[PDB]
């Protein structure tokens, strides 16, 4: 319900196995639309696989990855005077978290491992360390939002 | 035992018919099981309401099939005769099972 | 390994090796491997030449295989043309034989969608 104010959102519970909101949001984003229990198993096995390959708590590793992927400035698609002038806008924490997790899932399904369990585990690792597609996209979006500061004072 | 399965298209009409059957049974004298509504039966048929092609705004037709179960126990000839002697609504069909 | 003439790839199960053949498909792969005594899970690399000979004899004797399926399908196709049948006429005009869609679909017969002027 836009044009009327902030839109109410569905609340999110923590993971039963793990107990973290980021874990459950990652589950729902890796969730191929139609199945959850199998998607939950896949994200699970991915998180344990990240666990032994990191030796730490998968929730903390996912938090580190999300921080290494969370954006700070977003670019909309406003048309100003018939010319595409990019207006960067500060991102709210929920929107930035959603963007980071969406990027993580999108580049997780891109990987070429045997299973998307392995693909998601490798994506988690490559976002935590800072050598994955999600991290480089986080760098590129900030680079492009800083390259167009001349249009940043529009304040929309 | 007599299973008077009365069926009517109106819930209140069948309710009244079942109550009148129960009262006739009680007046003549016989055991009565409390009114047990059978769940339903539903057929959904759709129709393209247009003299020609207008596939938009179809309409689906329904019907109410209310069924009440009163398992009359130990019937009497003065009850059985009254079962088919008079049925004022004549819109509730009685199956004797 | 060696077979009637359809390759059995290095990383395909035995039923999976069979499924590639025109003569044998997945269901016939299961049937043949049950009748002969070869696992549907074992690889082509784990295959034995004696089992190869037994399998080849069984398939060539009790199953329509590459050659048998050709001499069946194409011979009866030309049979239904030579009787003038409209199954034959579906064959001739590049149409599905059972009279199903030829107007726009049936690309595997007439050939892919194209474009006229």
């Amino acid at each position: 319900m836009p044009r009327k104010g902030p839109a109410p959102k569905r609340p999110l519970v923590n993971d039963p196995v793990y107990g973290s909101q980021l874990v459950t949001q990652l589950v729902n984003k890796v969730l191929l639309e139609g199945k959850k229990s199998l998607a939950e198993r896949i994200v699970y096995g991915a998180l344990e696989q990240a666990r032994e390959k990191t030796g730490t708590d998968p929730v903390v590793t996912l938090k580190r990855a999300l921080d290494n992927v969370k954006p700070a400035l977003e670019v909309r698609s406003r048309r100003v005077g018939g010319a595409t002038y990019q207006v960067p806008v500060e991102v709210r924490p929920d929107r930035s978290t959603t963007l980071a997790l969406r990027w993580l899932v999108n580049f997780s399904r891109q990987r070429r491992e045997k299973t998307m369990v392995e693909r998601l585990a490798n994506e988690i690792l490559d976002a935590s360390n800072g050598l994955g597609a999600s991290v480089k996209r986080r760098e590129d979006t900030h680079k492009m939002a800083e390259a167009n500061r001349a249009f940043a004072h529009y304040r929309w | 035992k007599i299973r008077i399965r009365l069926k009517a298209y109106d819930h209140e009409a069948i309710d009244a018919s079942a109550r009148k059957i129960v009262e006739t049974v009680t007046r003549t004298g016989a055991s009565v099981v409390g009114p047990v509504p059978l769940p339903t039966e539903k057929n959904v048929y759709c129709v393209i309401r247009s003299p020609h092609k207008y596939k938009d705004s179809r309409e689906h037709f329904e019907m109410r099939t209310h069924k009440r179960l009163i398992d009359i126990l130990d019937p009497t000839p003065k009850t059985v005769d009254a079962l088919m002697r008079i049925d004022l609504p004549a819109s509730v069909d009685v199956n004797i099972q | 390994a060696r077979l009637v003439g359809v390759d059995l790839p290095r990383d395909k199960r035995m039923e999976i090796a069979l499924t590639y053949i025109y003569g044998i498909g997945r269901t016939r792969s299961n049937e043949i491997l049950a009748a002969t005594g070869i696992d549907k899970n074992m690889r082509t690399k784990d295959l034995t030449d004696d089992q190869v000979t037994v399998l080849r004899d069984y398939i060539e004797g009790n199953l329509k295989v590459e050659g048998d399926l050709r001499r069946e399908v194409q011979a009866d196709i030309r049979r239904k043309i030579e009787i003038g049948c409209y199954q034959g006429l579906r064959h001739r005009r590049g149409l599905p034989v059972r009279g199903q869609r030829t107007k726009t679909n049936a690309r595997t017969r007439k050939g892919p969608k194209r474009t006229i002027a």
Binding site: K36, S37 | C46 | -
Partner: protein
């Protein structure tokens, strides 16, 4: 004993309740067989997670209708209203923490001329 009716989309469960060492009796199954998803476990235990009665209290559930997650939610609601029945003080705690409010959110009525309810089919007007 005390029985609880948990109503879901179309999953309705009648549950007998009794204090005792935590047991979970389904329609011929335990809790560790009916919910192998390892997710509905804590979901159904959530009313038991909130008020500490996971193992001090018991459940003899008989379900009818619905599916795995739906019957998990029905069993969960049965647990919540059962905790209401046992301790009246549990009801305000569950209501405050968020419980005891049924969800009328079911698969809504399909709209005629649409692939799904609230789903307009893809189109290309000429």
């Amino acid at each position: 004993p005390i029985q609880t009716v948990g109503r879901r989309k179309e999953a309705v469960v009648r549950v007998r309740l009794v204090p005792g060492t935590g047991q979970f009796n389904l329609d011929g199954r335990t809790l560790e067989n009916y919910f192998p998803n390892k997710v509905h476990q804590q979901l159904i235990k959530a009313p038991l997670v909130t008020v500490d009665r996971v193992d001090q209290f018991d459940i003899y559930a008989h379900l009818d209708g619905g599916g795995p997650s739906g019957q998990a939610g029905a069993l969960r609601l049965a647990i919540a209203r059962a905790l209401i029945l046992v301790q009246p003080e549990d009801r305000p705690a569950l209501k405050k923490a968020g419980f005891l409010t049924r969800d009328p959110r079911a698969i809504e009525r399909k709209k005629y001329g649409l692939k799904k309810a609230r789903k307009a089919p893809q189109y290309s007007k000429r």
